[PDB]
Design an enzyme around this catalytic site. Structure first.
Site, PDB file in Angstrom:
ATOM      1  N   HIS A 156      -7.076  -2.874   0.414  1.00  6.91           N
ATOM      2  CA  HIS A 156      -6.001  -2.903   1.372  1.00  6.91           C
ATOM      3  C   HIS A 156      -5.980  -1.603   2.132  1.00  6.91           C
ATOM      4  O   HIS A 156      -6.946  -0.947   1.952  1.00  6.91           O
ATOM      5  CB  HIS A 156      -4.596  -3.176   0.554  1.00  6.91           C
ATOM      6  N   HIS A 164      -3.954   1.048   2.517  1.00  6.27           N
ATOM      7  CA  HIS A 164      -3.523   2.492   2.210  1.00  6.27           C
ATOM      8  C   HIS A 164      -4.761   3.259   2.272  1.00  6.27           C
ATOM      9  O   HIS A 164      -5.903   3.328   2.068  1.00  6.27           O
ATOM     10  CB  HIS A 164      -2.836   2.570   0.979  1.00  6.27           C
ATOM     11  N   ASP A 211      -5.668   5.510  -0.146  1.00  4.08           N
ATOM     12  CA  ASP A 211      -6.391   5.409  -1.429  1.00  4.08           C
ATOM     13  C   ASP A 211      -7.687   4.421  -1.252  1.00  4.08           C
ATOM     14  O   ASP A 211      -8.507   4.440  -1.932  1.00  4.08           O
ATOM     15  CB  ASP A 211      -5.508   5.364  -2.678  1.00  4.08           C
ATOM     16  N   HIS A 228       1.403  -5.921  -4.085  1.00  3.40           N
ATOM     17  CA  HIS A 228       1.509  -4.448  -3.842  1.00  3.40           C
ATOM     18  C   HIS A 228       1.481  -4.178  -2.175  1.00  3.40           C
ATOM     19  O   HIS A 228       2.082  -3.231  -1.653  1.00  3.40           O
ATOM     20  CB  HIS A 228       0.166  -3.795  -4.328  1.00  3.40           C
ATOM     21  N   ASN A 235       4.901   3.238  -5.565  1.00  2.00           N
ATOM     22  CA  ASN A 235       5.610   3.267  -4.360  1.00  2.00           C
ATOM     23  C   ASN A 235       5.552   1.730  -3.654  1.00  2.00           C
ATOM     24  O   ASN A 235       4.259   1.233  -3.622  1.00  2.00           O
ATOM     25  CB  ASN A 235       4.698   4.122  -3.288  1.00  2.00           C
TER      26      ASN A 235
END
Ligand code: S3C
Ligand code: ZN
Ligand code: ZN
Ligand code: ZN
Length: 231
Positions: free
Chosen positions: A83, A85, A87, A148, A179
């Site tokens: 995804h 993000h 990280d 998420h 988060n």
């Protein structure tokens, strides 16, 4: 034997052999004065390697490549970000400059662009609808639906029955939601249900952060998400 957050100094990367030709890579990162672990996957693809997700940043990702070079010695030719993000895509520029072909769903690339994150080059086809599955070298890519993040994918390694849930799956020691700014709380449990329905034979389940376990991690994440829903 699996390396924990407290044993990996930020900047370094540990590899953990899971099965024949299946590794996870573990890194750490500082966020708001706390240190977080982060998992990715490495899957052998003949005499090449398939990388799943960066090591959360350019410095970590460069060190991940150097550690793969040192420990495994096979070239990473392709990589998938699960995804948008940091990280998962932080370090894509490093991968691309190293000659790695980077991949992600159209959704992920768009969301990464909007966020100002690094953007994987190639667009993965066949993952537009919840429940879609596509083969990608030695793994199967699966879009379970929004969880998420709206774009999160999970990865399955049939040869070793390894299910990489990414950040859509929490580790057991995480009993509160992280988060969830970009999460679809309403749909997260249903999406986990789809993962369970499609990979019930999974023997080794990897969360996006923390220690692996079995399929219990799926129900565990549902419990935490629903608990957070009732906050
Ligand atoms: O809980 C997770 O798995 C992630 S990826 C949290 C997160 C979010 Cl939501 C935004 C930004 C960043 Cl950098 C991170 Cl780490
Ligand atoms: Zn995330
Ligand atoms: Zn290319
Ligand atoms: Zn994450």
């Amino acid at each position: 034997e699996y390396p924990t957050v407290s044993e990996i100094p930020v900047g370094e990367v540990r590899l953990y052999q899971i099965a024949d030709g299946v590794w996870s890579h573990i890194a750490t990162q500082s966020f708001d004065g706390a240190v977080y672990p982060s998992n990715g996957l490495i899957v052998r693809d003949g005499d090449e390697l398939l990388l799943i997700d960066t090591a959360w940043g350019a410095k970590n990702t460069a060190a991940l490549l150097a550690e793969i070079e040192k420990q495994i010695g096979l070239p990473v030719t392709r990589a998938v970000s699960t995804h948008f993000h940091d990280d998962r895509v932080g370090g894509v520029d490093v991968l691309r400059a190293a000659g790695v072909a980077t991949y992600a769903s159209p959704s992920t690339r768009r969301l990464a662009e909007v966020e100002g994150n690094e953007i994987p080059t190639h667009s993965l086809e066949g993952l537009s609808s919840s429940g879609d599955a596509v083969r990608f070298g030695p793994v199967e890519l699966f879009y379970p639906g929004a969880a998420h993040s709206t774009d999160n994918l999970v990865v399955y390694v049939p040869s070793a029955s390894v299910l990489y849930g990414g950040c859509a799956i929490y580790e057991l020691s995480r009993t509160s939601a992280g988060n969830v700014a970009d999460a679809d709380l309403a749909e997260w449990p249903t999406s986990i249900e789809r993962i369970q329905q499609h990979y019930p034979e999974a023997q080794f389940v990897i969360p996006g952060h923390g220690l692996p376990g079995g399929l219990d991690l799926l129900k565990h994440t549902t419990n935490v998400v629903k608990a957070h829903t009732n906050r």
